[PDB]
Amino acid sequence: DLEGLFLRLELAIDTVGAKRVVLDTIESLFSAFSNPAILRAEIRRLF
Amino acid sequence: DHGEPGVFVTFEERPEDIVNNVASLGFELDKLIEEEKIAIEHIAVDPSEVAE
């Protein structure tokens, strides 16, 4: 739920030597399983 | 000015972020924290790979 997004994002970042990033409709990915703190911690770690 | 030392307790932002925020206002918070007239402390529940 965290490592996969991190891995794909890092792969693409290294591909295009990204110095800018956009995250659109990240609201939907905030859908764990009725656990509030897990998604907050994932958000913080990603940022 | 009034010689009363103080401490800052942040629960969501980095001490570095706080100092950077007040930088542009001509406040030498970095100097104060390194001269021990003031302090900063960051407190958050779980670091990583552990339950909150």
Side-chain angles (χ1 to χ4, degrees):
Chain A
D1 67 354
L2 185 90
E3 65 184 351
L5 184 74
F6 281 30
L7 172 59
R8 182 58 165 175
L9 183 51
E10 187 178 8
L11 292 162
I13 282 155
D14 297 352
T15 313
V16 306
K19 308 186 184 165
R20 298 191 178 195
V21 183
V22 167
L23 302 173
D24 178 28
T25 305
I26 199 161
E27 296 285 333
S28 291
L29 203 64
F30 305 149
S31 177
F33 200 86
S34 314
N35 189 316
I38 204 186
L39 296 169
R40 288 173 64 195
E42 293 159 1
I43 286 161
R44 207 158 293 98
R45 280 187 295 263
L46 166 63
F47 292 5
Chain B
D1 311 324
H2 303 297
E4 297 182 33
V7 58
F8 198 111
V9 196
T10 173
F11 297 84
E12 192 61 282
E13 286 207 327
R14 281 186 288 180
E16 179 176 338
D17 300 358
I18 285 150
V19 175
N20 295 355
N21 182 9
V22 301
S24 39
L25 303 165
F27 298 139
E28 293 186 351
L29 186 54
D30 211 319
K31 180 176 181 186
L32 289 159
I33 62 156
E34 303 305 72
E35 298 306 330
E36 290 180 2
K37 297 295 187 190
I38 209 171
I40 306 175
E41 203 76 29
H42 59 98
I43 173 66
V45 183
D46 37 357
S48 169
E49 175 37 38
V50 174
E52 175 186 295

